[PDB]
Structure formats: structure tokens, C-alpha cells
Design a protein around this motif. Structure first.
Motif, PDB file in Angstrom:
ATOM      1  N   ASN B  24      -7.309  22.512  -8.156  1.00 30.36           N
ATOM      2  CA  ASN B  24      -6.991  23.431  -7.077  1.00 30.36           C
ATOM      3  C   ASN B  24      -5.706  24.198  -7.329  1.00 30.36           C
ATOM      4  O   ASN B  24      -4.931  24.464  -6.412  1.00 30.36           O
ATOM      5  N   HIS B  25      -5.513  24.558  -8.584  1.00 32.79           N
ATOM      6  CA  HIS B  25      -4.376  25.370  -9.025  1.00 32.79           C
ATOM      7  C   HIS B  25      -4.763  26.813  -9.190  1.00 32.79           C
ATOM      8  O   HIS B  25      -5.916  27.142  -9.527  1.00 32.79           O
ATOM      9  N   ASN B  26      -3.780  27.689  -8.980  1.00 29.03           N
ATOM     10  CA  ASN B  26      -4.028  29.132  -8.981  1.00 29.03           C
ATOM     11  C   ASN B  26      -3.332  29.859 -10.135  1.00 29.03           C
ATOM     12  O   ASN B  26      -3.351  31.094 -10.157  1.00 29.03           O
ATOM     13  N   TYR B  27      -2.780  29.111 -11.072  1.00 33.73           N
ATOM     14  CA  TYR B  27      -2.264  29.663 -12.324  1.00 33.73           C
ATOM     15  C   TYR B  27      -2.688  28.701 -13.429  1.00 33.73           C
ATOM     16  O   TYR B  27      -2.840  27.503 -13.171  1.00 33.73           O
ATOM     17  N   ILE B  28      -2.815  29.212 -14.642  1.00 32.12           N
ATOM     18  CA  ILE B  28      -3.005  28.381 -15.834  1.00 32.12           C
ATOM     19  C   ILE B  28      -1.611  28.238 -16.438  1.00 32.12           C
ATOM     20  O   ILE B  28      -1.049  29.206 -16.987  1.00 32.12           O
ATOM     21  N   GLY B  29      -1.064  27.046 -16.313  1.00 28.98           N
ATOM     22  CA  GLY B  29       0.284  26.748 -16.861  1.00 28.98           C
ATOM     23  C   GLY B  29       0.213  26.047 -18.181  1.00 28.98           C
ATOM     24  O   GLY B  29      -0.844  25.646 -18.670  1.00 28.98           O
ATOM     25  N   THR B  30       1.392  25.811 -18.754  1.00 28.40           N
ATOM     26  CA  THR B  30       1.464  25.095 -19.991  1.00 28.40           C
ATOM     27  C   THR B  30       0.809  23.718 -19.892  1.00 28.40           C
ATOM     28  O   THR B  30       0.227  23.231 -20.861  1.00 28.40           O
ATOM     29  N   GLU B  31       0.936  23.071 -18.728  1.00 26.82           N
ATOM     30  CA  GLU B  31       0.326  21.760 -18.556  1.00 26.82           C
ATOM     31  C   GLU B  31      -1.200  21.783 -18.634  1.00 26.82           C
ATOM     32  O   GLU B  31      -1.810  20.789 -19.042  1.00 26.82           O
ATOM     33  N   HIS B  32      -1.804  22.900 -18.244  1.00 23.87           N
ATOM     34  CA  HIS B  32      -3.265  23.022 -18.359  1.00 23.87           C
ATOM     35  C   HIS B  32      -3.684  23.256 -19.790  1.00 23.87           C
ATOM     36  O   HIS B  32      -4.732  22.763 -20.198  1.00 23.87           O
ATOM     37  N   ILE B  33      -2.851  23.970 -20.566  1.00 26.32           N
ATOM     38  CA  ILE B  33      -3.097  24.078 -22.012  1.00 26.32           C
ATOM     39  C   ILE B  33      -3.003  22.671 -22.623  1.00 26.32           C
ATOM     40  O   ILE B  33      -3.840  22.298 -23.426  1.00 26.32           O
ATOM     41  N   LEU B  34      -2.000  21.870 -22.241  1.00 24.05           N
ATOM     42  CA  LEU B  34      -1.889  20.494 -22.731  1.00 24.05           C
ATOM     43  C   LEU B  34      -3.133  19.671 -22.397  1.00 24.05           C
ATOM     44  O   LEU B  34      -3.699  18.996 -23.258  1.00 24.05           O
ATOM     45  N   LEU B  35      -3.562  19.710 -21.128  1.00 26.86           N
ATOM     46  CA  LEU B  35      -4.775  19.020 -20.732  1.00 26.86           C
ATOM     47  C   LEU B  35      -5.958  19.492 -21.552  1.00 26.86           C
ATOM     48  O   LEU B  35      -6.789  18.652 -22.010  1.00 26.86           O
ATOM     49  N   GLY B  36      -6.110  20.807 -21.752  1.00 25.70           N
ATOM     50  CA  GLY B  36      -7.235  21.316 -22.523  1.00 25.70           C
ATOM     51  C   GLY B  36      -7.201  20.878 -23.969  1.00 25.70           C
ATOM     52  O   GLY B  36      -8.242  20.590 -24.539  1.00 25.70           O
ATOM     53  N   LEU B  37      -6.015  20.818 -24.584  1.00 30.81           N
ATOM     54  CA  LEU B  37      -5.916  20.384 -25.959  1.00 30.81           C
ATOM     55  C   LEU B  37      -6.422  18.959 -26.115  1.00 30.81           C
ATOM     56  O   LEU B  37      -7.108  18.613 -27.116  1.00 30.81           O
ATOM     57  N   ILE B  38      -6.064  18.088 -25.167  1.00 26.07           N
ATOM     58  CA  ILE B  38      -6.502  16.704 -25.210  1.00 26.07           C
ATOM     59  C   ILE B  38      -7.976  16.604 -24.872  1.00 26.07           C
ATOM     60  O   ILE B  38      -8.749  15.943 -25.577  1.00 26.07           O
ATOM     61  N   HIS B  39      -8.404  17.231 -23.774  1.00 21.29           N
ATOM     62  CA  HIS B  39      -9.749  17.059 -23.266  1.00 21.29           C
ATOM     63  C   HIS B  39     -10.768  17.595 -24.215  1.00 21.29           C
ATOM     64  O   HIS B  39     -11.872  17.049 -24.287  1.00 21.29           O
ATOM     65  N   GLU B  40     -10.467  18.638 -24.982  1.00 16.88           N
ATOM     66  CA  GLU B  40     -11.505  19.080 -25.890  1.00 16.88           C
ATOM     67  C   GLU B  40     -11.778  18.056 -26.971  1.00 16.88           C
ATOM     68  O   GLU B  40     -12.895  18.033 -27.444  1.00 16.88           O
ATOM     69  N   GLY B  41     -10.816  17.199 -27.322  1.00 14.69           N
ATOM     70  CA  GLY B  41     -11.126  15.990 -28.075  1.00 14.69           C
ATOM     71  C   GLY B  41     -11.472  15.946 -29.545  1.00 14.69           C
ATOM     72  O   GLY B  41     -11.951  14.907 -29.999  1.00 14.69           O
ATOM     73  N   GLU B  42     -11.296  17.021 -30.312  1.00 16.44           N
ATOM     74  CA  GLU B  42     -11.773  17.090 -31.762  1.00 16.44           C
ATOM     75  C   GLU B  42     -10.859  17.590 -32.940  1.00 16.44           C
ATOM     76  O   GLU B  42     -10.894  17.161 -34.107  1.00 16.44           O
ATOM     77  N   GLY B  43     -10.050  18.530 -32.559  1.00 19.15           N
ATOM     78  CA  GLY B  43      -9.141  19.271 -33.404  1.00 19.15           C
ATOM     79  C   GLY B  43      -7.865  18.524 -33.716  1.00 19.15           C
ATOM     80  O   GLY B  43      -7.569  17.403 -33.229  1.00 19.15           O
ATOM     81  N   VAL B  44      -7.036  19.165 -34.531  1.00 19.53           N
ATOM     82  CA  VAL B  44      -5.792  18.537 -34.951  1.00 19.53           C
ATOM     83  C   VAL B  44      -4.828  18.316 -33.792  1.00 19.53           C
ATOM     84  O   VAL B  44      -4.089  17.322 -33.792  1.00 19.53           O
ATOM     85  N   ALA B  45      -4.828  19.204 -32.794  1.00 19.46           N
ATOM     86  CA  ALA B  45      -3.946  18.948 -31.644  1.00 19.46           C
ATOM     87  C   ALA B  45      -4.316  17.670 -30.890  1.00 19.46           C
ATOM     88  O   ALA B  45      -3.472  16.829 -30.606  1.00 19.46           O
ATOM     89  N   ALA B  46      -5.602  17.500 -30.584  1.00 17.42           N
ATOM     90  CA  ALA B  46      -6.076  16.280 -29.912  1.00 17.42           C
ATOM     91  C   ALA B  46      -5.717  15.062 -30.737  1.00 17.42           C
ATOM     92  O   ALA B  46      -5.263  14.037 -30.203  1.00 17.42           O
ATOM     93  N   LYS B  47      -5.950  15.128 -32.062  1.00 18.41           N
ATOM     94  CA  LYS B  47      -5.668  13.992 -32.913  1.00 18.41           C
ATOM     95  C   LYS B  47      -4.162  13.668 -32.879  1.00 18.41           C
ATOM     96  O   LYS B  47      -3.748  12.496 -32.849  1.00 18.41           O
ATOM     97  N   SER B  48      -3.340  14.709 -32.947  1.00 19.82           N
ATOM     98  CA  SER B  48      -1.907  14.525 -32.985  1.00 19.82           C
ATOM     99  C   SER B  48      -1.414  13.851 -31.691  1.00 19.82           C
ATOM    100  O   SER B  48      -0.612  12.916 -31.701  1.00 19.82           O
ATOM    101  N   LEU B  49      -1.898  14.315 -30.554  1.00 14.48           N
ATOM    102  CA  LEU B  49      -1.497  13.756 -29.257  1.00 14.48           C
ATOM    103  C   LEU B  49      -1.992  12.324 -29.087  1.00 14.48           C
ATOM    104  O   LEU B  49      -1.229  11.450 -28.664  1.00 14.48           O
TER     105      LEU B  49
END
Lengths: 7, 147
Positions: B24-49
Motif C-alpha cells: 500500500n505504498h505510493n512510491y517505488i523507493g530504494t527499499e522496494h528495489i532491495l525487496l525486488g532484488l531478493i524476491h526475484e531469487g536468481e541473479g548475482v544480487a540475490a545470491k550476494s544478499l
């Protein structure tokens, strides 16, 4: 680019 | 510049918008990019986190503590915050300097730590992942891929 997905 | 993003990096950005919407957020913030990096689950960012002990649940709890949810999920396009815009600009430079003409998930993560000031950065530090440590972990994993 760079305001929304994906502009 | 989205034309230069890998398929997976585009998926992270698309998913970041839905991470915001479902909170229920009305902006895409840095924290949503962080959530997306983790949630997508496959790439080097997800692995690193994952390899630093930064989980989707840890991030979600900190976002609820710092931001909290709105009352209604919005329809339509949710705008990036100023800091999220900066993260995506910086991602381009991270990629070029590492010898890439595409922007992958790792470069979005690197842009996020380079910006280093918004809600995602605050969350990472709160969860025990100093920004230099995150960067060095990305470098360490990328080096293993050169074998």
C-alpha cells in the motif's frame, strides 16, 4: 526512463 | 536506458513496483528495489544478499518498522522516489566500470549501495551488512564466475 516502470 | 537492462534486471524493476503496491505504498523507493532484488531469487544480487544473511523477511520487517503500510493498494503506475531514481542512474556506471554493456541485477545492487543513503541502505546496515561489505561480496562472487 526515468519516472515509472518502464519509462 | 531500460533497453540495456538484462531480462532479469527488468524483472527486478517490475517486481519492485509490485512490492510497493502490495504494501500500500505510493512510491517505488530504494527499499522496494532491495525487496525486488531478493524476491526475484536468481541473479548475482540475490545470491550476494543471501550469502550475507539478508533475507526477504529481514528486509520486510525493517520496512514495516521504518515506513509502514498505507491504507489502500494503488492502481496504475507508481513513481520512483528521488533516491530510487539515483540508484538506477548509478547502476549504469557500476556496469560500465565492471566491463559490462548491459545492466544486470548485480549492478542495481551496486547502484543501491553507491547511493548509500536511502531506506534500503538503512535497512542493510540495520541487518548487519555494511555497504563496503556488500560491495566486496559482489566483487568476490563475480570473481568466482571468471573461473
Amino acid at each position: 526512463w526515468l519516472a515509472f516502470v518502464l519509462v | 536506458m531500460y533497453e540495456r537492462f538484462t531480462d532479469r534486471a527488468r524483472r527486478v524493476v517490475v517486481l519492485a513496483q509490485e512490492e510497493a503496491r502490495m504494501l500500500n505504498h505510493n512510491y517505488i523507493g530504494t527499499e522496494h528495489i532491495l525487496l525486488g532484488l531478493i524476491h526475484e531469487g536468481e541473479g548475482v544480487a540475490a545470491k550476494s544478499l543471501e550469502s550475507l544473511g539478508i533475507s526477504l523477511e529481514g528486509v520486510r520487517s525493517q520496512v514495516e518498522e521504518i515506513i509502514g503500510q498505507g491504507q489502500q493498494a494503488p492502481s496504475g503506475h507508481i513513481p520512483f522516489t528521488p533516491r530510487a531514481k539515483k540508484v538506477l542512474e548509478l547502476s549504469l556506471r557500476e556496469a560500465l566500470q565492471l566491463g559490462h554493456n548491459y545492466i544486470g541485477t548485480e549492478h542495481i545492487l551496486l547502484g543501491l549501495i553507491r547511493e548509500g543513503e536511502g531506506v534500503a541502505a538503512q535497512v542493510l546496515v540495520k541487518l548487519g551488512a555494511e555497504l563496503t561489505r556488500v560491495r566486496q561480496q559482489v566483487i568476490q562472487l563475480l570473481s568466482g564466475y571468471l573461473e
